[PDB]
Write a protein that binds this ligand. Structure first.
Ligand SMILES: NC(=O)C1=CN([C@@H]2O[C@H](COP(=O)(O)OP(=O)(O)OC[C@H]3O[C@@H](n4cnc5c(N)ncnc54)[C@H](OP(=O)(O)O)[C@@H]3O)[C@@H](O)[C@H]2O)C=CC1
Ligand SMILES: NC(=O)c1cccnc1
Length: 350
């Protein structure tokens, strides 16, 4: 009846950097009391995501995300299997997900807060529902469709920052699926650069820690940049914007280089860069995937189809054990992941 759970131990501060120690794992007893409409689930996988950085602050800065509470269990995207149900629409063995899954090994939840998933959409890789066939992938798809202005055969050049992460590795491929002739990725390591061009189909890759970014954009985007799928903001984006074309579009996915600072989101561009934006009529609007829930079902089917068609390559990085949730979040925030960071909590499904 003993389970492990992760609680928020301390807050780093809006200007601080997150560390594994901000999280603490403890044991609690799960009273075997399952009531009408509740189910008991065994957690299989949990996600860690950049937005969780905002939940670590007392104030998140937006109505759509609530702050985590000190000493209370943390929660986020999760996938699990139902071990017992007293909910009339859920059965033992069903696989389910929630965007508010407690970081705990076994949980008793209200069946109405869960969504039953279909394994065949992901060829049995349930963790994909937390990534490419889930919110990150929907964010890339919907962001490109809504903000990218790409048409088949316009021969536009797309640059993707955070290119080897969950949203960015998916965004680059979709840019090719939908019409961009050239897709260039910017990422933090040599190893990621290699994967971008050798496996994910990117035309070129730029390592921002070791290359002269401006020099490499000029060499790999000889015609300028028409669409920038921005995951990072900061200096990298100032550089990309510098080479963006008239009437180009920034899909403002996120600005992770700024998440450990108290600047409101999204940060403004500096005077000189905003001047370029205004002179060249570059569009930079906010994009929040939660504003498009009505596009979710068909987005998931589209992402699933591309995957089943052999076109979309889905990458993930796995860390094991609930005791490593904190380290996994810290690792993903600092570049340890290729693709979607996932934490495997259990494989027990019988
Ligand atoms: N608009 C929306 O609704 C949504 C937005 N997002 C946003 O998309 C972005 C990517 O999210 P996601 O794909 O889940 O996570 P990723 O898998 O991309 O993981 C984060 C990556 O960010 C990179 N990074 C971290 N710090 C910096 C830094 N200081 N400068 C440059 N790159 C950095 C790291 O890779 P590297 O080694 O290359 O530095 C790291 O692996 C985030 O900004 C997130 O907020 C996600 C979902 C929805
Ligand atoms: N900005 C983000 O990364 C984000 C992700 C999911 C929900 N809200 C915000």
């Amino acid at each position: 009846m003993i389970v492990q759970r992760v609680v928020l131990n301390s807050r780093p501060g809006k200007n601080g950097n997150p560390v594994a120690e901000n999280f603490r794992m403890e044991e609690v007893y799960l009273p075997d009391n399952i009531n009408e409409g509740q189910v008991q689930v065994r957690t299989l996988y949990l996600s860690v995501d950049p937005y969780m950085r905002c939940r670590m602050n007392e104030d998140t800065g937006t109505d759509y995300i609530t702050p985590w509470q000190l000493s209370q269990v943390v929660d986020g995207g999760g996938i699990g299997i139902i071990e017992e149900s007293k909910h009339t629409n859920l059965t033992k063995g069903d696989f389910v997900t929630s965007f508010y899954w407690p970081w705990q090994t076994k949980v008793i939840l209200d069946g109405n807060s869960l969504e039953k998933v279909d394994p065949q959409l992901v060829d049995g890789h349930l963790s994909y529902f937390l990534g490419a066939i889930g919110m990150p992938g929907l964010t890339s798809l919907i962001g490109i469709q809504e903000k990218g202005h790409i048409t088949a055969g316009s021969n536009k050049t797309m640059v993707v920052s955070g290119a080897a992460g969950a949203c960015g590795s998916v965004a680059g491929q979709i840019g090719h699926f939908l019409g961009c002739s050239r897709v260039v990725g910017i990422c933090g390591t040599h190893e990621k650069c290699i994967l971008l061009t050798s496996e994910l189909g990117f035309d070129a890759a730029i390592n921002y820690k070791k290359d002269n970014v401006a020099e490499q954009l000029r060499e790999s985007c000889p015609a300028g940049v028409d669409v920038y799928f921005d995951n990072v903001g900061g200096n990298i984006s100032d550089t990309v914007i510098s080479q963006m074309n008239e009437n180009s579009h920034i899909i403002l996915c996120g600005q992770i280089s700024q998440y450990n600072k108290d600047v409101p989101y999204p940060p403004p561009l500096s005077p000189a860069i905003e001047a370029i934006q205004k002179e060249r009529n570059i569009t930079r609007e906010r994009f929040l995937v939660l504003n498009y829930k009505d596009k979710f079902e068909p987005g998931i089917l589209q992402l699933s189809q591309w995957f089943k068609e052999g076109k979309l390559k889905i990458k993930e990085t796995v860390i094991n054990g609930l005791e490593n949730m904190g380290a996994a979040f810290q690792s993903m925030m600092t570049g340890g992941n290729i693709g979607k960071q996932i934490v495997c909590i259990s494989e027990e499904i019988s």
